[PDB]
Curated annotation (Swiss-Prot):
The keyword Transferase applies. S-adenosyl-L-methionine binds at residues 48, 77, 82, 108, 130. Keywords: Cytoplasm, Disease variant, Intellectual disability, Methyltransferase, S-adenosyl-L-methionine, Transferase. Its EC number is 2.1.1.8. It is an enzyme of class 2 (transferase). This is Histamine N-methyltransferase. Belongs to the class I-like SAM-binding methyltransferase superfamily. HNMT family. It comes from the Eukaryota. Gene3D superfamilies: Vaccinia Virus protein VP39. The gene is HNMT. GO terms for cellular component: centrosome; cytoplasm; cytosol; extracellular exosome; nucleoplasm. The lineage of its organism: Eukaryota, Metazoa, Chordata, Craniata, Vertebrata. InterPro entries: HHMT-like, SAM-dependent_MTases_sf. GO terms for biological process: histamine catabolic process; histamine metabolic process; L-histidine catabolic process; methylation; respiratory gaseous exchange by respiratory system. Inactivates histamine by N-methylation. Plays an important role in degrading histamine and in regulating the airway response to histamine.
Amino acid sequence: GKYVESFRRFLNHSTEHQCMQEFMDKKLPGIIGRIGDTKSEIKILSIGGGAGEIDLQILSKVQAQYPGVCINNEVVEPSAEQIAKYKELVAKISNLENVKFAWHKETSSEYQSRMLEKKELQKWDFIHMIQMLYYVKDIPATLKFFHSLLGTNAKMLIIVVSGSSGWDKLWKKYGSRFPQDDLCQYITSDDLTQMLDNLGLKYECYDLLSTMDISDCFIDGNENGDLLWDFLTETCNFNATAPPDLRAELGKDLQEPEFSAKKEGKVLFNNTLSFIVIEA
Ligand SMILES: CCN(CC)CCC[C@@H](C)Nc1c2ccc(Cl)cc2nc2ccc(OC)cc12
Ligand SMILES: Nc1ncnc2c1ncn2[C@@H]1O[C@H](CSCC[C@H](N)C(=O)O)[C@@H](O)[C@H]1O
C-alpha cells in the first residue's frame, strides 16, 4: 500500500510525468506514426500502466494519428489500487471515444506465462513498459517475450532512469548498503541497452532531463522530506533507522552535482529518463 502512495509522493515532487508528457508531445507521434497502418483495430498493451495518466496521453496521440480507428488498450497491472485510480481517470475522460479498455490484475510474468498457455501468441501494435522493469525478475526474458508479441510495424517503448541520472550514482555508491531485494532491481538505461544489444534487438534511446525536488529532505522533521528519504533509500523510516553516519554521508552526496543541482533555492536530484524504442 505504501509502494503506490510513495510513488505518488515522488510524482508530486518531480517533473517525471511532465518530462514524459514532453516526450509524448514531441517524439511519440513520429514513433507511432505507422503502428496502425493497414489496420482497422490498433492494439496497445500497457505493462505496469499504474494510474493511467501516461497511458492516456499515449492513447491521445494514437487516436490523433488514426482518427476513427478502434483502439484496444489492455493493461497488465498487479495493483488493485492503481487499477482503481486508472478506471477513475478514464471515467472522467470523454475525448477517447474510439478506445476500449481492459484491466488485468496480474504481473507481466503471469501475463507471459498465461499467454504461453495457448496455441497462438497474441500480437500487439504498441507495447509499453514505463518505469516498471525494476520490478521484473527476468528482464531479458521479459524483453524477448514482449518483443516477440510485436505485430507488423509495431513498436515497444520502455522507460527507465538513465545511466546518467542521479539514481545511477546513488546505486553504484550506496546500492549495497541499501536493502537488497529481487522485488526491485537497480537498473538504468545502461543495463537495458546492454541486455537489448545482447538480445540482438534494434532500438533507439532518447534521454530527457527530469528532476526530483528533494528540498524537504534537508529539513529535519519534515514529513514529506522523511518520506522522500524512504523513497530514495527504499527503506521505511530511513531517518529513524539508518546509521547516523550513513544518513550524514548521503545528505552530503545528495547535494553534490553528481546527484543533484541547486537552483532557485531548491535541491533538484537528477532524474534524467531514458526512452527506449524497440523495433519489431
Ligand atoms: C528510480 C526508483 N525506482 C526504481 C528502483 C523505484 C521506486 C520504488 C519505490 C516506489 N518502492 C517499490 C518497491 C521497493 C522495495 C521492494 Cl523490495 C519492492 C518494490 N516494488 C514496487 C512495485 C510498484 C511500485 O509503484 C507503485 C513501487 C515499488
Ligand atoms: N511485475 C510487474 N508486472 C507489471 N506491472 C508491475 C510489476 N511490478 C510492479 N508493477 C507496476 O509497475 C508500476 C510501476 S510505477 C508505474 C507508473 C506508470 N507506468 C507511470 O509511469 O506513471 C506500478 O503501477 C506497479 O504496480
